[PDB]
Design a protein around this ligand. Structure first.
Ligand SMILES: [Ca+2]
Ligand SMILES: [Mg+2]
Lengths: 152, 64, 142
């Protein structure tokens, strides 16, 4: 795991511990969130598998219990550009690299581990995804911006 | 080719939850500083408010 | 302490110094206290005098206040900390939001620190005035 990466989880654990009241335990419902701050992108399915809960209040974890959890999430399977384009290829009806704003927002909020409409509203804002006069977006740009993350 | 399309969408959705948390990170950190400043300084005030010297100075503050 | 402040304590000091001899005794504090309202009990008078290492002239007076009154953030620092939670720069926070921040998060306030903070707080129409509260908490108001 590297000492440095253990220090790095130390600094995130501490940050989250303060925000649910500083007592050396972070809520097991923020388990996935601490791991994403560390640069990994597991599925909710992955973090439930290492003990993550479905609700605040349910269970709380001290540092040395976050440690093996983060250790096992780090080998969760992450999607590639290649896969992303192929998936979004399946919604492209005209073959020119577009997908309408509504079909995008529909695939994200409806399929897989559906995001909330609020989650979709936000990501669209941050990536600055704009529709053209016909209401389409280039999904290859969106895909590149999401993967590049907020700082960039 | 569905289960796979669905697994691939979930991993893209996973990228997105990542982006959103890591975006949110820097604001949590800044705000931790803010809430600490507020919490520790209100408490200095509470301590000062029950210090007898303060209590005394505070009643002679008007008469001056 | 600032000059205007250092100058304010001089005047406070020469009213507390009831017998004008230039030191403050247990007797002076009692005479001036009983004059302002219910005096503190003599166990308490004893003890606030035990706070001065030697004789209680102005120099030692100034100094016990300066020690107490330091190690706290400027008004600008405190106002900006609150403002992190006020993104529209409305210069208020909803009353329910600031209680929730203080009580439930960070180094949580207990019911009595909560009781005491908001006993004093400028709240109107469901809005806590943090600009005024900061002045109150730093004395540029109260
Ligand atoms: Ca905690
Ligand atoms: Mg005297």
């Amino acid at each position: 795991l590297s000492q440095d990466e253990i220090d790095d989880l130390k600094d995130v654990f501490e940050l989250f511990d303060f925000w649910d009241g500083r007592d050396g335990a972070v809520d097991a419902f923020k388990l996935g969130d601490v791991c994403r701050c560390l640069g990994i992108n597991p599925r909710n399915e992955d973090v439930f598998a290492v003990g993550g809960t479905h609700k605040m209040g349910e269970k709380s974890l001290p540092f040395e219990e976050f440690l093996p959890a983060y250790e096992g999430l780090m080998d969760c399977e992450q999607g590639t550009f290649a896969d992303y384009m192929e998936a979004f290829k399946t919604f492209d009806r005209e073959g020119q690299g577009f997908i309408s704003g509504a079909e995008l927002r529909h695939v994200l909020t409806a399929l897989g581990e559906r995001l909330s409409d609020e989650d979709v509203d936000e990501i669209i804002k941050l990536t600055d995804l704009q529709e053209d006069l016909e209401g389409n977006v280039k999904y290859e740009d969106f895909v590149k911006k999401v993967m590049a993350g907020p700082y960039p | 080719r569905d289960e796979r399309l669905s697994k691939i969408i979930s991993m893209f959705q996973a990228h997105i939850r990542g982006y959103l948390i890591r975006k949110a990170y820097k604001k949590l950190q800044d705000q931790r500083i803010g809430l600490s400043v507020i919490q520790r300084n209100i408490r200095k005030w509470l301590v000062l408010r029950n210090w007898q010297w303060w209590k005394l100075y505070s009643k002679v503050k008007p008469l001056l | 302490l600032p000059q205007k402040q250092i100058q304010e304590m001089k005047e406070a000091f020469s009213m507390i110094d009831v017998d004008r001899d230039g030191f403050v005794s247990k007797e002076d504090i009692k005479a001036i206290s009983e004059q302002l309202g219910r005096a503190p009990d003599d166990k308490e008078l004893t003890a606030m005098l035990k706070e001065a290492p030697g004789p209680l002239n102005f120099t030692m007076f100034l100094s016990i206040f300066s020690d107490k009154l330091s190690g706290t953030d400027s008004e600008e620092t405190i106002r900006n900390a609150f403002a992190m939670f006020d993104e529209q720069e409305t210069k208020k926070l909803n009353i329910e939001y600031i209680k929730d921040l203080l009580e439930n998060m960070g180094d949580n306030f207990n019911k009595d620190e909560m009781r005491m903070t908001f006993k004093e707080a400028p709240v109107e129409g469901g809005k806590f005035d943090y600009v005024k509260f900061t002045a109150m908490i730093k004395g540029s108001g109260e």
